[PDB]
RNA sequence: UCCUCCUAAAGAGUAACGGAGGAGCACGAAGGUUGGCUAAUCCUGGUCGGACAUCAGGAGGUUAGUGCAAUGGCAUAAGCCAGCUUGACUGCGAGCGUGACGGCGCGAGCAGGUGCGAAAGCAGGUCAUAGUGAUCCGGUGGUUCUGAAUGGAAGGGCCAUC
RNA sequence: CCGACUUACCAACCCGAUGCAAACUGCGAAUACCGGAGAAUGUUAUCACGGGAGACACACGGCGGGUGCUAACGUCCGUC
């Protein structure tokens, strides 16, 4: 369905990322969340990026 | 005469059986973590030393003997563990 | 409030002697007055719901609560959660002030007013009455009204029966027919 | 002809017909016809027996039909093999156990009531007996 | 292929071209937490308003609701509303359930770092049960591994994901 | 307009009596199953690991059932 996969990339300099599914049409603005980054071992802002 | 074709059934589906039900009965000794009941909904409720999982599975949080009991105004069935 | 003291000093004591209540707490009391505009046409243009809300504000002196559809009704093309009306509930001082305005200046302005129906009671001492057009309230500037719109008044009381409720209101010279 | 106006399900298991009846007592009329055998009554048989007794009393008095045919019976057409699903519904039956009161009557002489039920019983497959309303 | 009920004989399991219905998802809120709240339907009285809209009162007592089938649950609500948030966390895991196996499921408690709450505490997605596809091959990012004389590199491994 | 009479008819809710249900339950056995203690009896009859298999066309009879016509030396399950 229109629910489409995206990844969230750590705003730290690490490469670490999460993956998630987003409804591209109804919510066009970028998803942004604080999540744990196990490379720096801190909660950090993550931002939507292409899978 | 002519042999005449039959029709077809529209039914014919079922799901796999899930092995629900009581796994340890009254007086039975259990270790912590032991599953006591697999449920759909809280047909039994968690008493003392008993936990309830995300799927309403009841499990031992202490070692002891399983005690079934009826409690409260609603006459609901509670499972508890008594220390040995 | 002026009519509140009239209640304390006359209505309560005459009612005591009329029904022979044993305790002053047994005498009926007005609990709240509620204004309702069932706008309805808010299904079309939301400015109509707004304009109707402004009228209740001017009449009552407080911001109305907009009321949403309890359930969808295809008979009126309303979905659940659509705004259908607005309400105001008056209590305490501002209730008595509105009640005074209503009797003393508002209902006299009703067209061909012969008095209110004495039978408009629910059976438990609450009185409810409609008004056909907003102009009975001088706070509405006749020069600026957009559309005709009425509203419902409801008076809720501690009365146990309509005979007690009617006696309470009549004691204010509430203009029954 | 008696059928449920509607039912929750269309087809039903065969089941079994063990046991003895509830409803062993005359309850509305003074006289009745009691089942002594065991078996099925079809809606057609119930109606045929009904018509027989009403003719005998020339519509006088009143008649209560105590049984109702609520069980659907399926059959397959001819020249079809086994399988391919359950057959189509053909007719409705009531399961009768010994002791069930099938019909009741009052408003007529007993000597006429016996004659009316004798004519009706000749249509029913099960054996039946004439019974009277007891005190207690 | 998967889920729910009956058949199924009061533990589990149990066939048939037996009887009945659904899935091949949705949601950054429809998740977390703190605080609060309680339904359907019907009868009375009220502007337009009608069998059915919003309002007040009463009866009733869950006959309502649950994002989507059915069953089992739910008032301490799992139903309804609002504030603040990202625990829809990373590494593990005593001990169990269910499979011939591959596998699937439940889980207290540890370490790090968070959210709500005065605090006790709660949070490792959603009332639970469907919303799915092994291996091979190949792509993308990272990495304290390997690097065919030696120093690199290619290619491979490991980790995340397609 | 409102509305009255009458019925060759039907008539929900509620109340009293009477039945039916695999996919109804405010009730509810006998058995079977799980755990614990005790005596006797039993060639360890139990479990784990390892070597070698064969078998995966079943049949009838009793009891409980689906399908069929409570037909079949019919068909598909449970248990002996
Ligand atoms: K079963
Ligand atoms: K919330
Ligand atoms: K062996
Ligand atoms: Mg031939
Ligand atoms: Mg199942
Ligand atoms: Mg079973
Ligand atoms: Mg059994
Ligand atoms: Mg709460
Ligand atoms: Mg339910
Ligand atoms: Mg759900
Ligand atoms: Mg080299
Ligand atoms: Mg084979
Ligand atoms: Mg063969
Ligand atoms: Mg075989
Ligand atoms: Mg066999
Ligand atoms: Mg055979
Ligand atoms: Mg058979």
Quick one: resolution in A? 2.7
CA distance D108 to chain B (A): 54
Cα C43 to its chain centre, rounded Å, is 25
Strands laid side by side in the B29-30 sheet: B29-30, B64-71, B76-82, B45-46
Query: Can you spell out the DSSP letters for chain C?
Result: -HHHHHIIIIIHHHHHHHHT-SSGGGS--EEEEEEEE---GGGT-HHHHHHHHHHHHHHHSSPPEEEEPSS-BGGGTBPTT-EEEEEEEE-THHHHHHHHHIIIIIGGGSTT---B-TT-B-SSS-EEEEES-GGGSTTS-TTT--S---EEEEEEES-SSHHHHHHHHHTTT--B-
Specify whether the CB–CB gap between C42 and C84 falls below 8 A: yes
Q: Residue C152's closest CA among C68, C38, C49, C65?
A: C38
Sheet holding C151-157, edge to edge: C65-68, C83-90, C30-37, C151-157, C127-131
Number of residues that this document lists for chain C? 177
Experimental method for this entry?
Answer: cryo-EM
Strand-pair partners of A45: A34
Helix, strand, or coil (residue D116)? helix
DSSP string, B13-66: --PPP---EESS-TT-EE-TT-EEEE-SS-SSEE-TTEEE-TT--EEESSSEEE
Contacting partners of chain A (3+ CB pairs under 8 A): none
**Secondary structure element (H or E) that encloses residue B69, with its range:** strand B64-71
Q: Residue C90: give its domain's CATH number.
A: 3.30.1440.10
CATH superfamily placement of domain D21-136: Ribosomal protein L16/L10 (3.90.1170.10)
Contacts of B12 in chain D (CB under 8 A): none
Task: Note the CA–C1' distance, C49 to F14, in angstroms.
Answer: 44
End-to-end alpha carbon distance in chain D: 34
Task: Determine how many CB atoms are found less than 10 A away from the CB of residue B23.
Answer: 17
**Residues contacting C171, CB < 8 A, separation 6+:** C10, C11, C14, C15
Structure tokens at D36: 């002594």
Nearest to C168 by CA among C21, C2, C1: C21
Asked if residues D18 and D79 have their Cβ atoms less than 8 Å apart, the reply is no
CA atoms within 13 A on the CB side of D40: 14
Strand F CB shell (< 7 Å): B 24-29; D 8-9, 11-17, 21-23, 25, 27, 66-68, 70-71, 74-76, 82-83, 86-87, 95
**Token pair for residue B56?**
């309403």
Q: Which residue segment(s) compose the domain that C62 sits in? A: 1-177
Residues 6+ apart with CB under 8 A from C104: none
Handedness of CA B66, B69, B71, B74 (dihedral sign): positive
Around Cβ A8, how many Cβ atoms within 10 Å? 21
CA of D89 to the centre of ligand 12 (A): 38
Q: Give how far Cα A33 sits from Cα of A29, C131, D34, Å.
A: 13, 55, 80
DSSP string, D40-67: EEEHHHHHHHHHHHHHHTTT-SEEEE--
Strands (E), chain D: 31-35, 39-42, 62-65, 71-75, 88-96, 101-106, 128-132
List b or e across C43-80, with b for residues whose CB sees 16 or more CB atoms inside 10 angstroms. Answer: beeeebbeebbebbeebbeeebebbebeeeeeeeebee
Residues C165, D22: Cα–Cα separation, whole Å:
58
Query: Rounded to the nearest 10 degrees, how much is the dihedral formed by the CA atoms of D74, D77, D82, D87?
Result: -30
The protein footprint on chain E, as nucleotides within 7 A of a CB, is: 2-8, 11-22, 25-29, 40-41, 44-58, 71-74, 76, 78, 85-91, 94-99, 105-108, 112-114, 125-129, 141-143, 160-162
- Say how far apart CA D108 and CA D31 lie, in whole Å: 9
The sign of the dihedral angle between the CA atoms of D44, D50, D52, D55 is: negative
**CA gap D104, D26 in Å, rounded:** 7
Question: Which chains are adjacent to chain B, needing at least 3 Cβ pairs under 8 Å?
Answer: D
How many B-D residue pairs are in contact by the CB < 8 A criterion? 16
Does the distance separating the beta carbons of B9 and D84 come in below 8 Å? yes
Inspect the interface and report whether the beta carbons of D84 and B4 lie closer than 8 Å. no
How distant is C1' of E119 from CA of B32, in Å?
29
What are the chain D neighbours of B1 within 8 Å (beta carbons)? 79
Beta bridge partners of B68: B79
**Beta D71-75 vs D31-35: how paired, if at all?**
unpaired
Task: Find residue C129's DSSP bridge partners.
Answer: C153
Nearest protein residue to nucleotide F33 (CA to C1' distance) is B25
Q: Do B9 and D85 touch (CB under 8 A)?
A: yes
For residue A20, the surrounding DSSP H or E stretch is: strand A17-23
- Residues ≥6 apart with Cβ < 8 Å to D3: D43, D69, D92
Helix, strand, coil percent values for chain D (each to nearest 5)? 20, 30, 55
Q: What are phi and psi of D132, to 5 degrees?
A: -125, 150
**Domain locations in chain A?**
1-51
- Nearest-Å Rg of the Cα atoms of chain A is 11
How far in angstroms lies nucleotide E104's C1' from the CA of residue B82? 32
Q: Does B12 touch chain D (CB under 8 A)?
A: no
């Amino acid at each position: 369905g229109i629910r489409e996969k995206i990844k969230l990339v750590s705003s730290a300099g690490t490469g670490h990322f999460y993956t998630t599914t987003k409804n591209k049409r109804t919510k066009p603005e970028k998803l942004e969340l604080k999540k744990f980054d196990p490379v720096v071992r801190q909660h950090v802002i993550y931002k939507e990026a292409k899978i | 005469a002519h042999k005449k074709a039959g029709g077809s059934t529209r039914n014919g589906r079922d799901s796999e059986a899930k092995r629900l039900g009581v796994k340890r009965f009254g007086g039975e000794s259990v270790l912590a973590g032991s599953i006591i009941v697999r449920q759909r909904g809280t047909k039994f409720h968690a008493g003392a030393n008993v936990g309830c999982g995300r799927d309403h599975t009841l499990f031992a949080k202490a070692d002891g003997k399983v005690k079934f009991e009826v409690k409260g105004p609603k006459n609901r069935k509670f499972i508890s563990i008594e220390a040995e | 409030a002026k009519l509140h003291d009239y209640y304390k000093d006359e209505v309560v004591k005459k009612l005591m002697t009329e029904f022979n209540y044993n305790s002053v707490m047994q005498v009926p009391r007005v609990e709240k007055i509620t204004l309702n505009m069932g706008v309805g046409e808010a299904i079309a243009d939301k400015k109509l719901l707004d304009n109707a809300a402004a009228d209740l504000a001017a009449i009552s002196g407080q911001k109305p609560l907009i009321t949403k559809a309890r359930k969808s009704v295809a008979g009126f093309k309303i979905r659940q959660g659509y705004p259908i009306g607005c309400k105001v509930t008056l209590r305490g001082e501002r209730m008595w002030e509105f009640f005074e305005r209503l009797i003393t200046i508002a209902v006299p302005r009703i067209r061909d007013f012969r008095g209110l129906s004495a039978k408009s009671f629910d059976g438990r001492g609450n009185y409810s009455m409609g008004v056909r057009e907003q102009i009975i309230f001088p706070e509405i500037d006749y020069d600026k009204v957009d559309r005709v719109r009425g509203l419902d008044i409801t008076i809720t009381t501690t009365a146990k029966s309509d005979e007690e409720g009617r006696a309470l209101l009549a004691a204010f010279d509430f203009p029954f027919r | 002809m008696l059928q449920p106006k509607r039912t929750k399900f269309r087809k039903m298991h065969k089941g079994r017909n063990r046991g003895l009846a509830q409803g062993t007592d005359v309850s509305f009329g003074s006289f009745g016809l009691k089942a002594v055998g065991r078996g099925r009554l079809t809606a057609r048989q119930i109606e045929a027996a009904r018509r027989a007794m009403t003719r005998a009393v020339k519509r006088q008095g009143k008649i209560w039909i105590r049984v109702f045919p609520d069980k659907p019976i399926t059959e397959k057409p001819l020249a079809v093999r086994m399988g391919k699903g359950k057959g189509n519904v053909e007719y409705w039956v009531a399961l009768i156990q010994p002791g069930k009161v099938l019909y009741e009557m009052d408003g007529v002489p007993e000597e006429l009531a016996r004659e009316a039920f004798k004519l009706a019983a000749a249509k029913l497959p099960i054996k039946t007996t004439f019974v009277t309303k007891t005190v207690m």
